[PDB]
Design goal:
Distance between the termini of chain A: 34 Å
Bound molecules: N,N-dimethyl-7H-purin-6-amine
Largest interface: A-B, 23 and 23 residues
CATH superfamily of chain A: Histidine kinase-like ATPase, C-terminal domain
Helix content of chain A: 25-40%
Strand order of the largest sheet of chain A: 1-6-5-4-7-3-2-8
Number of helices of chain A: 5
Oligomer: homodimer
Assembly: dimeric
CATH class of chain A: Alpha Beta
Strand content of chain A: 15-25%
PDB class: chaperone
Chains A, B: Heat shock protein HSP 90-alpha
Order of helices and strands of chain A: EHHEEHHEEEEHE
Keywords: nucleotide binding, ATP-binding, Nucleotide-binding
CATH topology of chain A: Heat Shock Protein 90
Entry title: Crystal structure of Hsp90 with fragment 42-C03
Chain lengths: 204, 204
C-alpha cells in the first residue's frame, strides 16, 4: 500500500534548482539536517516540560550519524518529536519563494536553512532520500523521493521509538560523505556547538 | 494585579553571566530577537496551512523595529504566533546548561542562539525588558524583568492583534542602538536574508 503525491509546484522548482545549479560547496547539507534534528528535539523537549508521558517512547534525546559504505547511505537519526502522516505530506511536501527572491539578490544556496527549507539540501548529495518517522500520535511511516516531481508515503515492520531517520542514498560521486574523517570535519566545522549529543557510528 | 515569579535558578545564572561577563560584541542581540520573531512567524504560518481561521487576528506576517529616543527604548514587534500566559511563565522563565558546557569548551556568547536561549541576549544592552504578547487562545499579557532573579506577569488596555512586542529600555551607554544607521548596519550584517519583511520605523 503506497501513495504517490505530486510535490507542490514550488517545492519541485526548489528541488530542481538544488539538483541542477552548479554549486561545489555541497557539504552544508549535513548542518541543515543536524539542524532540523535539533529543532525536532527542541520540540519533544518543550512539550515534555508540561506532560512527561510524552517521553514514554524514548527518554534519550540525541542524534546518530550512521554511514554504510555497502548501501552507500548516510542515515541521520534523531529521537526528536517525529512526524504524523499529515506532516510528512505537508511539511515535506512559501519559505521557498522568499528563498528565490533572496537567491535573486546575492544570496546563495548555503542560506537555504534560513528559509525553512533546509531539508531539500539533501539533494545536493543524494540520488534518493527515504525518511522513516514515528510521532507519538500516529503509526510509523515511510516517505520517499528521487525528485522528478513526486513522493511516496507508505506505513513502514522494524519499529523505532519516537523519532526520525533520514536515509541518504548518495550520488555515486558523493561517497566522501561516507568517510569518517570527512564527517568529523563537517560536524566540527558547521555544527560544533548544538544542544544535543551527536554520535558518529563506526564501521563495520 | 501583578504576579512575581523567581527565575528558575539556571536562567538566573545565565542571565547573570550575560550582564556581568565583559563582552564588547553586544550587537548580536538584535539578530537573536529578529531570529525569535521569525520562528514565531514560522509557527503561526505552519499552523494556518491547516486552519486559516488562525490568521483572523492578523493576516500580515512581519517585523517592525521601533526606536524611540525619548523613552530610550527599542521595540522589536512581530505578528507571529504569540505566547499564552503559561508560555510566558515557562518559555521565558536545559539549553542553558549545554550552553555553559559549551561556554567551557571555547564557545562564546554569540552562539547563545544556537542553544534555545537567545531571548536573554537582550540583557547585553537593556536595563529592563518588557514583553507584551497576545496568543490566539488567551488574553493579552505583560511580562517584565530587570533581572536580579525575578519577573512579573500581569494582563495588559491597548490591544495588539496576535503577536509579540519586545520592549528594550536600553542601558544608558547603549543608545547607539536607537540610531537609524546603527540599526540598518546590524540588520544588513546579521539578518540580511530572513523570510519575512522587516520595517525600520523612522523618528519622529
Ligand atoms: C520537517 N522536518 C525537517 C522534520 N521534522 C521533525 N523531525 C525531523 N527530524 C529531521 N527532520 C525533521
Ligand atoms: C519564546 N519566544 C522567544 C517567543 N515566542 C513567541 N513569539 C516571540 N516573539 C519574539 N520572541 C518570541
Amino acid at each position: 500500500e503506497v501513495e504517490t503525491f505530486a510535490f507542490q509546484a514550488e517545492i519541485a522548482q526548489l528541488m530542481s534548482l538544488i539538483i541542477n545549479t552548479f554549486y561545489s560547496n555541497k557539504e552544508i547539507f549535513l548542518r541543515e539536517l543536524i539542524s532540523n534534528s535539533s529543532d525536532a528535539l527542541d520540540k519533544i523537549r518543550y512539550e515534555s516540560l508540561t506532560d512527561p508521558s510524552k517521553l514514554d517512547s524514548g527518554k534519550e534525546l540525541h542524534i546518530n550519524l550512521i554511514p554504510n559504505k555497502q548501501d552507500r547511505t548516510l542515515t541521520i537519526v534523531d529521537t526528536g518529536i517525529g512526524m504524523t502522516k499529515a506532516d510528512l505530506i505537508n511539511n515535506l511536501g512559501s519559505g521557498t519563494k522568499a528563498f528565490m527572491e533572496a537567491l535573486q539578490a546575492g544570496a546563495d544556496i548555503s542560506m537555504i536553512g534560513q528559509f525553512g527549507v533546509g531539508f531539500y539540501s539533501a539533494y545536493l548529495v543524494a540520488e534518493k532520500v527515504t525518511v522513516i518517522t514515528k510521532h507519538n500520535d500516529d503509526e510509523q511511516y515511510a516517505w520517499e523521493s528521487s525528485a522528478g516531481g513526486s513522493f511516496t508515503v507508505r506505513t513502514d515492520g522494524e519499529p523505532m521509538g519516537r523519532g526520525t531517520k533520514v536515509i541518504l542514498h548518495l550520488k555515486e560521486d558523493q561517497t566522501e560523505y561516507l568517510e569518517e574523517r570527512r564527517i568529523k570535519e563537517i560536524v566540527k566545522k558547521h555544527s560544533q556547538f548544538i544542544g544535543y549529543p551527536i554520535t558518529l557510528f563506526v564501521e563495520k
